[PDB]
């Protein structure tokens, strides 16, 4: 991880990837894979609409 926590190699270059996005994150297979970040984030307070 870089300090933005974008994944990088020994020389800081961004390991591009196909982004799981949306909610739950869904694989954008075929979107331009671009720099991938693993930043920590709050676990969204999302409702128990159906249980």
């Amino acid at each position: 991880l870089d300090e933005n926590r974008n994944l990088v190699n020994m020389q800081g270059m961004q390991l591009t990837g196909y982004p799981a996005t949306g909610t739950p994150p869904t694989i954008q297979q075929g979107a331009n894979p671009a720099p991938i970040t693993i930043p920590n984030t709050l676990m969204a307070a999302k409702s128990t609409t159906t249980a």
């Binding site: 869904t26 075929g30 979107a31 331009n32």
Partner: protein, 50 residues
Amino acid sequence: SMQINLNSTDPVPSKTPFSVSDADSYNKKGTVTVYDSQGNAHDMNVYFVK
């Protein structure tokens, strides 16, 4: 030129018609890029509803 192949166990995308990126609204996504005379670039998304 972009070519695709599919398997027909897919349903109707429940939210029909297609919309830009809402996740259920397409059986597959595609992307390709084009150009214009200013030297710009656009990016095109391609989607499938069957």
